[PDB]
Amino acid sequence: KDRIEIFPSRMAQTIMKARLKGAQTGRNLLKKKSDALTLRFRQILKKIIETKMLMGEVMREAAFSLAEAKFTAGDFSTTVIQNVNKAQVKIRAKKDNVAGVTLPVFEHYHEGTDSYELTGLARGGEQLAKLKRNYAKAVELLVELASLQTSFVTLDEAIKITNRRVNAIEHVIIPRIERTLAYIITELDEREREEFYRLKKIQEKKKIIKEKSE
Template sequence: MSSAGGQRPAANRMTLQTFKARLGGASKGFKLLKKKRDALKSRFQALLKDIVDTKLKVGESLKDGAFALAKAHYASSGDDIASSIVERAKKPSVTTKMYPDNVAGVSIPVFKVLRNASQEAIAHTMGVGSGGAVLNATRDTYLKAVECIVQLASLQTAFHTLDEEIKMTSRRVNALEYVLIPRIEDIIHYITQEMDEQAREEFFRVKKVVEKKKVKLAKEKEQAEKNEAAIDAPSILQKKDADIVF
């Protein structure tokens, strides 16, 4: 793999060291992120199952609610329940609160239902004339439905958050696995190659120098011999001294 047109760094021992350190960091990060992704994914799968279950439950409970409402309509003898309920509704008795939950370092919002029964006191006087019991039953049925819906909302939000997170983590894992680490390896490979090359060059140069020197020496030696022969006059000393080269 090429270095994608990136600038080749200077090939020396120091850069090699830095790149080796970077490679170590990247592969450590890669391993960690992969672990995180797997954890998220396993959570995600569990969540999917939960969501399907809850969705079915919501459908069921809403059906129950609609049925209970039909019952209430029947019991309140055609009075318009909706408007009297709207008239009474002032403060919500059911609220949701968000708590953070932590999965592999990702904070996921979890919604919880809070019910303040005291706010419902007004609604209790509904249908005192007739059908009050049925209305109360309807309210309870719908309350269950609301709880299911909130649970579903919580799961869905977690689903979305996890989905985003998994996508991001996968992108990072892939980027590390297929781009960053190969690039660093490539560079390291290049640097080592380059350094080998340099070493070989150096070796060759030294060899060359030695060779040249030898040649030069030989030449000089020859010259000296020639000179000696040319002179060839009886030496002043006559006697050849072994220590004297020239």
Template structure:
């Protein structure tokens, strides 16, 4: 069966035409929503890829600075400061917080690093190297934030591609054309049938008018042909016989009505 013959089996009425137009409008609205969703996901996907590249470049520089700051702290304070930091730590300075972001109906996880303001290493390096310890801590916190950001972006990457593929498959023009064809063919069929019914009604009314006109003409011809014969007969009116016409005000005796 060709695409032109694909239509739904409906009775050609005005109500069916309205229903098919509503279905076609819903299909076009769904297609436009899929288009906007695909564009939003594709834009976000490209933004994520660019952010991953930029974050990786920044991560390389930050990790290099963190390694240099650790070496500088070890050189100034000695190797014993590492054990002091491990022994003085009571709570974690950084905690990972997870939330979800809705992007066009697709929920993606987002990681966020929460920094604890309580500092357990305030007394470390009090004799010497306190500035280097503070600098090393700030540099490593910055490196952790960048690593968390990179992890969040890389978590974005795997679920994003299947979501785009699914939306693009639904948004494909050929699939859209196949979905719209039955509704369009059905609307075309209903319109043609309704036009045919209107033409039949118009033809029937026209024939009725022609028949009425023909009947009226035949009646007029009959009356016209009967008029001369009526004029040749003598009038039987009371006035022609010399008898005055009866008065409407004159009372006359009527016969009794017997039931």
């Protein structure tokens, strides 16, 4: 609705000016928070593009190392896929922070159970070891990229919410207070005008009393 529904008065005018400036301070701070989130989000998008580009090359090299391993080691794929046991790699989620907003990111970490030790023992040897190394490199790059993606999504949510807050303020709350202030000023002018009329009337009646007495 149009007006805040405070009753006209000088006290009300003071309170409304305080509240208008409070809402404008909120607008400014939230707009700066949105700008921080937007700069970070844009940076994160650009690095997503760049790291996808790097991922292309890195995966291509890893696939060639796999080819090279097959060259020496043969069809070990089934060996690996069967001796699954438990994972040597386990990822830890971490609470990053930008602006007031918490960004989930990932930390690469090892549980140490290399179920595929000795697998290349017969022939695979160094080529299979280098394959382990290549896909460890891939794991690191993709963990960094996954931290990137999670930050990107959460920043998207944060940006949407903060823009909705800033628009809400500057399109509803501030205009509401401005309308209430205009109404308060008008009604105080009305009080003053009524007082002026009453005093003018009293003065005229005193003049008429002078004429009645003289």
